Structure 1
Amino acid sequence: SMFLPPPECPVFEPSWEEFADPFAFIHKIRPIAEQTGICKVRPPPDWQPPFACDVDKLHFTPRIQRLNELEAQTRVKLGGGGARDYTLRTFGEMADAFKSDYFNMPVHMVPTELVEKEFWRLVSTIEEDVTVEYGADIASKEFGSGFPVRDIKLSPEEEEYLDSGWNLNNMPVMEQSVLAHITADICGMKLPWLYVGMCFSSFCWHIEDHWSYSINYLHWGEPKTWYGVPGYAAEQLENVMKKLAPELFVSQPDLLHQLVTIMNPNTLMTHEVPVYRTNQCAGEFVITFPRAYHSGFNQGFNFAEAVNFCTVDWLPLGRQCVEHYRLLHRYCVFSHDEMICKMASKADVLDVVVASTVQKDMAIMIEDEKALRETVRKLGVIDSERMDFELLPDDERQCVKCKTTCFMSAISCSCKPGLLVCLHHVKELCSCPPYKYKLRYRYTLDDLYPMMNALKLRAE
């Protein structure tokens, strides 16, 4: 009556056979799980990656979090800095005492249902001002991955798991994650993040950059409670949230200024947005699918690790996402077309199903590019010059108007040195007549078709 828990998301228990290839497995469950946005994956009983670390030598700078529903929070502070510092031990001592004192109970006697119910009570009650702390950072020397990494001499147990597809360190380089081919720096997106949780520390409603998948592993500790919404209902959810908290939707000039919030799943459910839940326990995986909104909170002291990835399934959505970013004037993490062309240029060493799928996206790219160039020629842009867009830092090749990262082409004018617009915004560069403009382009149409043909040959 005050909190009605959403229905449970799918839970999968793959055999060692199914578990052997994560991408094949994820492809298998996709028809089911994309309907719920998140799913939980239980590895085979004996898949037990060894965790070991010194709780006194691992330190991190804590982030502070107020717990008020609908209140604005900023997504990531990928740079911590800070003066406050916990070791894993001192944070754990703080975390356990907090939970223990909050409920006046020992921590594993506090029922998960109760913590959940209480969480939604405290975030909605205005004069409760509970604040908590948490850790969130990419792997570093002061704090590294929870999975085995090859360096230091390792035990045969760690060696068995060193190359596992489910070892999340391996997805920044695994063959069928399209992100692995990106030569551009996308560190904040490609490397695993480490999260140290405590009771009620939470992650606001969000979707991944470029609508990528994510996969989260809870190494140890108390559970992590999740809420998930399927990709098809993304705009539904956004409409509900814009109505209840429009501040979050004002434009901001950074990827370092994305605004997000806590919001009761019952609110979404009242507005007919489908929402699912799960308690992720130690040793379990949660997977989020493209454009699946998700949020949640930790039940107590714990340690999780997560990473983004992109399968070939995702390529058309990646293209749609950047188009969606353009309409919103949202910054890109990388150029999707640049990634496509990078892959085309490596067609011979590409996996063959990958090659086939890249070829299809490239064909759309080329077709759209052809049409755009015809339009800008008709606007009176005549001069042109080839330009190696991939050499420019990102902040020197964003469209003035829509902020998209240019790669296929842009318009410049000697009137405004260094400024560029994409071909959707030829009118937005300056007041000079179009005959003063240059079309800057990475490839001629004639360069492009042979690149696509290499993919076709590789794929047959």
Structure 2
Amino acid sequence: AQNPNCNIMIFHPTKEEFNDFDKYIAYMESQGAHRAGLAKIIPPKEWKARETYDNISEILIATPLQQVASGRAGVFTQYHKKKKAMTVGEYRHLANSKKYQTPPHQNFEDLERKYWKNRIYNSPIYGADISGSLFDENTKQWNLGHLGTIQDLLEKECGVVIEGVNTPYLYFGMWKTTFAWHTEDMDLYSINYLHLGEPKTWYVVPPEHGQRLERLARELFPGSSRGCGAFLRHKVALISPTVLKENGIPFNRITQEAGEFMVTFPYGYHAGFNHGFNCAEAINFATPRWIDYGKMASQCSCGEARVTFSMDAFVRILQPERYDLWKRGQD
């Protein structure tokens, strides 16, 4: 069995190996990468996402989100308070302001310590989930706006043609902006490219151990757990590495830098934070191996999780018994 300890693996594809996306995902899996829940892919030196980032300041962040925490330093929830629209250039200035800028630090480890110690006492503003792409149309390899669609994958594997579309999203981050513990919608894969700026630290639980994290989360957020049998789908709960280690939950950590891809695998729980001003692009995707995870994915039916148009067909086709309840939660 490859990668039996479920370590995060890092890949350095050649330019030739970077041509066929599906093939390379399958190669990584042949080496056990999925066991970790997360892999890093460093693109060949010949590759570029686009020529420059000099012209991105006019992009609009229509609904910047201020991430307000409640709880204790290692165990908290966050809610998103909507703020007035601002451009990327306005957001970058805000991120770099004394109120929001990254503090002096020695190295990633020192910054990580500062994050866990101090995150709850601040409310950073995140430009998340902005439909769009920063890949040049002429970038043919690993261009997140030109991947095979999940609807086409389900059609190819199962024979059923469905409605829906699959497009990427931009994330503009600052110091302490946070992504809560989650798996993807319908336990899909995700791929994330860090276009520019400061790093992003990830934490991940191996898919084979995801239920351990769920059980801890029910313990730690007991009101939330009573409200919803899949409340991690709400994407509001944080648990620190220290707390995870105290409770024996298997996990790993890695820092992604600008110019690097991360792939999250089906049912790989992940969480993390941004080091300073940055811009990432991410999209969900599927492979044949995903279908079995999609059929077994938990779902939130309490109303909170509220998701894209395109999840309807996945639930309807893969989870017909759950569909009527889930759709009531949509409505």
Short-chain TM bin: 0.7 to 0.9
Looking at structure 2, the residues matched to 331 and 93 of structure 1 have their Cα atoms a distance apart, in angstroms, of 32
Match of 1:40 in 2: 40
Higher RCO (C-alpha 8 Å, min separation 6): 2
What is the SS of the residue equivalent to 2:271?
Answer: strand
Looking at structure 2, the residues matched to 269 and 312 of structure 1 have their Cα atoms a distance apart, in angstroms, of 34
Distance apart, 1:102 and its partner CA: 5.8
Q: Summarize the Cα distance change of 1:290–1:89 in structure 2 as closer, same or farther, 3 Å threshold.
A: same
More strand by share: 2
Q: Summarize the Cα distance change of 1:174–1:19 in structure 2 as closer, same or farther, 3 Å threshold.
A: farther
TM-score (norm 1): 0.60
Q: Summarize the Cα distance change of 1:295–1:89 in structure 2 as closer, same or farther, 3 Å threshold.
A: same
Q: Which amino acid in 2 is paired with 1:59? A: L
Q: Which amino acid in 2 is paired with 1:146? A: L
Match of 1:334 in 2: 312
Listed as ranges, the gaps of 5+ residues in structure 2 are: 1-5
Q: Summarize the Cα distance change of 1:36–1:328 in structure 2 as closer, same or farther, 3 Å threshold.
A: farther
Note if contact 2:315-2:323 (Cα within 8 Å) is conserved in structure 1. Answer: no
- Over the aligned positions, Cα root-mean-square deviation in angstroms equals 3.5
Note if contact 1:8-1:277 (Cα within 8 Å) is conserved in structure 2. Answer: no
Asked whether 1:283 is paired with 2:259, we answer yes
Match of 2:207 in 1: 231
Listed as ranges, the gaps of 5+ residues in structure 1 are: 1-6, 150-158, 341-364, 373-396, 406-418, 420-460
Distance apart, 1:277 and its partner CA: 1.0
What is the SS of the residue equivalent to 1:225?
Answer: strand
Asked whether 1:138 is paired with 2:135, we answer no
Q: What does the per-residue CA deviation read over 1:350-392, in whole Å, with 9 as the maximum and x for residues that have no partner?
A: xxxxxxxxxxxxxxx9xxx9xx9xxxxxxxxxxxxxxxxxxxx
Question: Larger radius of gyration, structure 1 or 2?
Answer: 1
Q: What does the per-residue CA deviation read over 1:97-149, in whole Å, with 9 as the maximum and x for residues that have no partner?
A: 2478663x4xxx752222111001114xxxx621110101232xxxx311124
- The one of 288, 295, 301 aligned to 1:312: 288
More helix by share: 1
Q: Summarize the Cα distance change of 1:98–1:23 in structure 2 as closer, same or farther, 3 Å threshold.
A: farther
Looking at structure 2, the residues matched to 296 and 113 of structure 1 have their Cα atoms a distance apart, in angstroms, of 14
Q: Summarize the Cα distance change of 1:241–1:110 in structure 2 as closer, same or farther, 3 Å threshold.
A: same
Match of 2:11 in 1: 12
Looking at structure 2, the residues matched to 14 and 99 of structure 1 have their Cα atoms a distance apart, in angstroms, of 40
Q: Where in structure 2 are the equivalents of 1:249-398 lying within 5 Å?
A: 249-251=225-227, 258-321=234-297, 324-325=298-299, 333-336=311-314, 339=317, 398=323
What is the SS of the residue equivalent to 1:17?
Answer: coil
Q: Summarize the Cα distance change of 1:24–1:99 in structure 2 as closer, same or farther, 3 Å threshold.
A: farther
Between the aligned residues of both structures, percent identity stands at: 30
Q: Which amino acid in 2 is paired with 1:334? A: D
Q: Summarize the Cα distance change of 1:99–1:276 in structure 2 as closer, same or farther, 3 Å threshold.
A: farther
Q: Which amino acid in 2 is paired with 1:73? A: Q
Q: What does the per-residue CA deviation read over 1:207-226, in whole Å, with 9 as the maximum and x for residues that have no partner?
A: 01111100000001011110
- The one of 201, 204, 208 aligned to 2:177: 201
TM-score (norm 2): 0.81
